[PDB]
Amino acid sequence: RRNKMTAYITELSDMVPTCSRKPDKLTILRMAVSHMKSLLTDQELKHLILEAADGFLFIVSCETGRVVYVSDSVTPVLNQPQSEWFGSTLYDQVHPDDVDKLREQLSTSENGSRRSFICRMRCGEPHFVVVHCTGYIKAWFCLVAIGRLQVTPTEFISRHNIEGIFTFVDHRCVATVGYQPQELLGKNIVEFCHPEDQQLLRDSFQQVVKLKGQVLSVMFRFRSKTREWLWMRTSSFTFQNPYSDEIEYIICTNTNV
Amino acid sequence: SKETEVFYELAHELPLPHSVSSHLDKASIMRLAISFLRTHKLLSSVCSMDNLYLKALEGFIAVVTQDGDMIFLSENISKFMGLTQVELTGHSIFDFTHPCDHEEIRENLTLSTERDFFMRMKCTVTNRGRTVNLKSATWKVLHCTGQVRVYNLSCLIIMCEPIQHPSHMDIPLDSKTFLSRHSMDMKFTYCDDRILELIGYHPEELLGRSAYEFYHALDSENMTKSHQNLCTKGQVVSGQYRMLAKHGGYVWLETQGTVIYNPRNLQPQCIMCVNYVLSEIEKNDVVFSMDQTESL
Ligand SMILES: O=S1(=O)N=C(Nc2ccccc2N2CCCC2)c2ccc(Cl)cc21
Numbered sequence A: 001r002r003n004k005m006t007a008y009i010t011e012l013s014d015m016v017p018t019c020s021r022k023p024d025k026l027t028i029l030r031m032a033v034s035h036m037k038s039l040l041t042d043q044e045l046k047h048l049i050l051e052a053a054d055g056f057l058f059i060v061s062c063e064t065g066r067v068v069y070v071s072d073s074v075t076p077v078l079n080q081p082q083s084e085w086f087g088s089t090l091y092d093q094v095h096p097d098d099v100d101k102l103r104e105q106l107s108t109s110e111n112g113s114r115r116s117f118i119c120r121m122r123c124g125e126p127h128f129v130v131v132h133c134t135g136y137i138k139a140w141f142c143l144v145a146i147g148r149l150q151v152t153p154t155e156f157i158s159r160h161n162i163e164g165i166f167t168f169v170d171h172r173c174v175a176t177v178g179y180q181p182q183e184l185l186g187k188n189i190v191e192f193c194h195p196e197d198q199q200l201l202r203d204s205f206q207q208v209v210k211l212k213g214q215v216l217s218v219m220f221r222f223r224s225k226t227r228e229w230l231w232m233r234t235s236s237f238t239f240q241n242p243y244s245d246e247i248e249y250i251i252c253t254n255t256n257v
Numbered sequence B: 001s002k003e004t005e006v007f008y009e010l011a012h013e014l015p016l017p018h019s020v021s022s023h024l025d026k027a028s029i030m031r032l033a034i035s036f037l038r039t040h041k042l043l044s045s046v047c048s049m050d051n052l053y054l055k056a057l058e059g060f061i062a063v064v065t066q067d068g069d070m071i072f073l074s075e076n077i078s079k080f081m082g083l084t085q086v087e088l089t090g091h092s093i094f095d096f097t098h099p100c101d102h103e104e105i106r107e108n109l110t111l112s113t114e115r116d117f118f119m120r121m122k123c124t125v126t127n128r129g130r131t132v133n134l135k136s137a138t139w140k141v142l143h144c145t146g147q148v149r150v151y152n153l154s155c156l157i158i159m160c161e162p163i164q165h166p167s168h169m170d171i172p173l174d175s176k177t178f179l180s181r182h183s184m185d186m187k188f189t190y191c192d193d194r195i196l197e198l199i200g201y202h203p204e205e206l207l208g209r210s211a212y213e214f215y216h217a218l219d220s221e222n223m224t225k226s227h228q229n230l231c232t233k234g235q236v237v238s239g240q241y242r243m244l245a246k247h248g249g250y251v252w253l254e255t256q257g258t259v260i261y262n263p264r265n266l267q268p269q270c271i272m273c274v275n276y277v278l279s280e281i282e283k284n285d286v287v288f289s290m291d292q293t294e295s296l
Helices: A001-015 A024-037 A042-053 A074-077 A098-107 A197-212 B004-011 B028-048 B049-054 B076-081 B099-109 B194-198 B217-233
Strands: A055-061 A069-070 A114-122 A128-137 A142-148 A156-160 A166-169 A216-223 A229-240 A247-256 B060-065 B070-073 B114-123 B137-152 B154-162 B179-180 B188-191 B235-236 B241-244 B250-261 B268-277
Touching: A001 A024, A001 B241, A024 B028, A042 A055, A042 A142, A042 B028, A042 B049, A055 A074, A055 B049, A098 B070, A114 A142, A114 A247, A142 B049, A166 A197, A166 B060, A197 A216, A197 A247, A197 B114, A216 B268, B004 B179, B004 B235, B028 B060, B028 B070, B049 B070, B060 B114, B070 B114, B099 B137, B099 B154, B114 B154, B114 B217, B137 B235, B179 B194, B217 B235, B217 B241, B217 B268
Parallel strands: none
Antiparallel strands: A055 A069, A055 A142, A114 A128, A128 A142, A156 A166, A156 A247, A216 A229, A229 A247, B060 B070, B060 B154, B114 B137, B137 B154, B179 B188, B179 B268, B235 B250, B241 B250, B250 B268
């Protein structure tokens, strides 16, 4: 108790050189008083928000979407000048497919209220970043908000049932094997394998299910749309539902070799 | 001795209302002043409309130190946790969080400087605005995003946002946000009719289907992790991910998940999901899963 108080007074004195023969307790109390009198404003809070979540404040009009205030922070989050944002509407700074959603969030027909949504805003052939906007409405009708950026071939991956049927295949297949994804789905992978290698493939599948979780590996000749035998390495592991441990499917990464 | 009045003037000079500052014991004033000084030090490091910035936030800002001291918390924290700024500033973060998370917090304070995680903090506020005390406390999942930086040692500046409870909704939901209900294995069991217009699925055909089959494989690493978090802490926010659309292509989604329990036997019943559609159907020509082809 008394030790905590002494450590408190000392750590107070610790960081302040002005008072640091260390004096009477009352004098360091009035000392901290006088040092604080020389000294929480908004610019530090702005930098705290920009540090924590890379966010910037903006006030727009609820009716015409013309922004009435953008903070400087708009420049590091979107590489967009302040002069751009000021004098325009949010509809111009938002992905065209996102205007209707904007329209509702800026609507005053439904409801001091609070807003929270996601959209895509263009940054400095265009490019859009996902921005989470949280804010409320203010008569000034206007929307006060903070928009923040969270921001946190030679192969193709496929999903299979434990039998070996393609239940999922990514587009990269068309470049590696030459098939459109539709010609692979619903068919067993051993259908596309050289018969001489087929058994091997099947064995590997039996092994990925017996040895759950562990990634297994097999190399075989895959038939392409051009009917050429292409050697390929497939690394396969079963994926389990993290709650029930049920095998959802088997993930394979088929890599040209 | 008038040291009591010296403390009075210390608290008045402290940056907060007089009604809060004067109802303060000695050690509490010492704590507050020390933390304000250390926060000012780090702020000099980093920097070299307050009510608007504060009330426009869906969370609270906190700068914690390497030893776990919460040397600064913003005023709005009460609005979210009940515990107030003066009650928490200066105390260790481990004295307020779920112990089963502590190690994870311990691993985000250490040492790339970007941090993004979920923790459980004490909460004495209820959905009615009424506030209970420390002995009767509910765990509240916070999504914390921030940066760890070094000053002259280390500290962690993080925004912590709560994840809304789908039952206790206080904000408007737009045309392209819809609700979904799952068992705890994430198997679909209820979905909103908006999914027919948004992704093309009719609610009925999804019933009983595993959601693990309906997301682009490239996102698996995220999704499972979220599931795991959802099952260890009861609430989670996913990253941006791709859900395959009915007739080919996919659509971009971000969804919050909450484990909801039966009030009568207190067991977890199922999972709610507030899904934010973030785009239209992209690459609608390409099919990726068997559920799309059988739909041609
Ligand atoms: O693309 S899904 O089929 N997968 C979904 N969720 C999911 C799948 C596998 C693991 C974890 C999760 N999550 C846990 C909470 C956030 C998401 C989901 C949710 C809602 C809709 Cl409408 C569609 C889908």
